[PDB]
């Protein structure tokens, strides 16, 4: 049961699962341990919390597009969104605002605060 690097092996089966759900995924850019998903109501009322919550996978598409996948721990319905432009992603407090698909606002609350800024700086690079 020898393993020269357990983290490379951990990320090997991680990409194996992401390709099983989305074959267009080419590689993993970064991973966040625990991430909760919030959704801003289109009625412009309050900050509703979505039932989506799981591991955050910063992923790169076959077309070199940079998006993210969230394996939901509460339902098979995962979250797969692409970041078309860095001007759509902002960082407010311990949230990661993202305006995707014309008018829509999703907020990513990450458990580890160091993961939020690291992902945010990578998103600003394509």
């Amino acid at each position: 049961p020898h393993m020269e690097d357990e983290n490379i092996l951990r990320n090997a089966v991680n990409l194996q699962v992401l390709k099983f759900h989305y074959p267009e995924i080419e590689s993993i850019i970064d991973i966040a341990s625990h991430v909760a998903v919030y959704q801003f109501d289109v009625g412009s009322q309050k900050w509703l919390k979505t039932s989506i919550e799981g591991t955050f996978f910063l992923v790169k598409d076959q077309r070199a597009r940079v998006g993210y996948v969230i394996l939901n721990r509460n339902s098979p319905e995962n979250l797969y969104l692409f970041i078309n432009h860095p001007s759509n992603v902002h960082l407010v407090d311990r949230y990661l605002i993202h305006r995707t698909e014309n008018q829509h606002v999703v907020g990513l609350w990450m458990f580890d605060p160091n993961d939020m800024s690291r992902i945010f700086n990578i998103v600003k690079e394509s």
């Binding site: 089966v13 699962v17 759900h21 039932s51």
Partner: protein, 242 residues
């Protein structure tokens, strides 16, 4: 539609990365936190993954845990030294006792399901946590009377039930057949449920392997009880005609 054509090794691959592989450093070293995710992975396998693929077998918590450990070599180092500490915790963990009832009709092909008010609240059997110094039968009667308005005190049998530990809960649902279909269910006691309707057992996912599995409505903690309930009704129809 996600796990329709998924092998059992791929399912263990998904549940591994989804629940137990990407925890932080201190959480993976914790027996309580590692056991908590495995119980969640077991419930996720029974309630969701099996409904999308009937080929996958129904497993118990202790059996599912054993296959998942041998599946991932990253836990072989952990399970070799923390074997006795984990097996004692998985068996003796304090779990929330929940009691309920599976009310069937006279023909034993329609059951009573209850649904909440939340948009994502799925259908489930009337159950709930037990109170202090409360009996197993008394808790099931109370939860049914509160969530459905029907008093099954004169019909509940302490020996006819399905007991199963799932998602960190010791669940025991007492099977009560012969409920009149004309029963007026009024959940005036608890305003946290919305609808109470009879559901044909054949319409639930895992009950009828021959029928095409279409899962248009959501079900919560209903699929894992279908395999024992199908076996239970099969033995009752034989015992009624012997």
């Amino acid at each position: 539609m996600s796990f329709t054509n998924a092998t059992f090794s791929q399912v263990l691959d998904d549940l591994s990365a989804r629940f137990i592989l990407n925890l932080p450093a201190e959480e993976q070293s914790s027996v309580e936190r590692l056991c908590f995710q495995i119980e969640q992975a077991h419930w996720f396998y029974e309630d969701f993954i099996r409904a999308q693929n009937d080929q996958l077998p129904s497993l118990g918590l202790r059996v599912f845990s054993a296959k998942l450990f041998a599946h991932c070599p990253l836990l072989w180092k952990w399970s070799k030294v923390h074997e006795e500490a984990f097996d004692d915790f998985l068996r003796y963990k304090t779990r929330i006792p929940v009691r309920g009832a599976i009310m069937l009709d006279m023909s034993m092909q329609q059951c009573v399901l209850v649904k909440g008010w939340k948009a994502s609240s799925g259908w489930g059997f009337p159950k709930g946590k037990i109170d202090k110094d409360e009996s197993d039968v008394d808790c099931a009667i109370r939860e049914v009377y509160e969530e459905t308005g029907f008093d099954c005190s004169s019909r509940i049998n302490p020996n006819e039930f399905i007991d199963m530990t799932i998602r960190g809960q010791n669940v025991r649902l007492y099977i009560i057949p012969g409920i009149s279909l004309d029963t007026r269910f009024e959940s005036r006691t608890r305003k946290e449920i919305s609808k109470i309707e009879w559901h044909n057992l054949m319409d639930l996912p895992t009950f009828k392997k021959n029928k095409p599995q279409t899962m248009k409505n959501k079900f919560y903690m209903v699929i894992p009880f279908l395999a024992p309930l199908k076996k239970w009704i099969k033995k009752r129809n034989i015992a009624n005609n012997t």
